[PDB]
Amino acid sequence: QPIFLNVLEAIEPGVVCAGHDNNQPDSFAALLSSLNELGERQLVHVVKWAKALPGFRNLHVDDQMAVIQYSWMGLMVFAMGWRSFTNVNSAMLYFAPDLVFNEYRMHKSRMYSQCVRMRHLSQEFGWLQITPQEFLCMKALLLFSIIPVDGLKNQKFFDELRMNYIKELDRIIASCSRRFYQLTKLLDSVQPIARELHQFAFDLLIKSHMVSVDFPEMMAEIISVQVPKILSGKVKPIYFHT
């Protein structure tokens, strides 16, 4: 209905491939070198996506940059889970066309637990009957769901921008009331999974010269600089419920 919904649609990225050799077998190293590359490509995309968000150019440049690096994994997880719901009805993990996980890739990549978790999420799209427009507006907010305890450079704008994003989600909803608790519940559950993945990538990064996994330019930096912040409690997610 509104202008808002046109934008989220319009700006929504397209198909992004990982370029995986689906012919050779499933080594850890092969698998995770392609996820890192998948991370790298989708990040670019989250950047060009986010810059085009409504209200986004109201934040201090450093705030923009920050808010993005902190929330990228959280977003990645969400659309991944939509993708896996929408293509394969949550039967497997749809990272990309050329990189769909099956239980075997799940266990060989060594992320079985986190993978189990994200498959649960994908299911929830279906269980809770998530409309495409509910998906987009939920996604938009996740970028505004994670800040330093310390606080952003222009914190007022953020608070404001966010408030209007929560408003638009409520608008696209409005015993209906319980839909919100559900949708906020659902967003809230994204944060644990992004933390687990933060940890594993973090671990992985450190051991990586000594297991032969490829960490792209942008990968190695974000993980070693901004990820630790989150894992040390310096940077928290905003939760709806307690």
């Binding site: 950047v47 440049v61 923009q64 940059m65 690096q69 330019e217 942008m218 930096e221 974000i222 600089v225």
Partner: peptide, 7 residues
């Protein structure tokens, strides 16, 4: 950063 640079 090399992030600050391409942004």
């Amino acid at each position: 950063s090399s992030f600050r640079d391409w942004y």
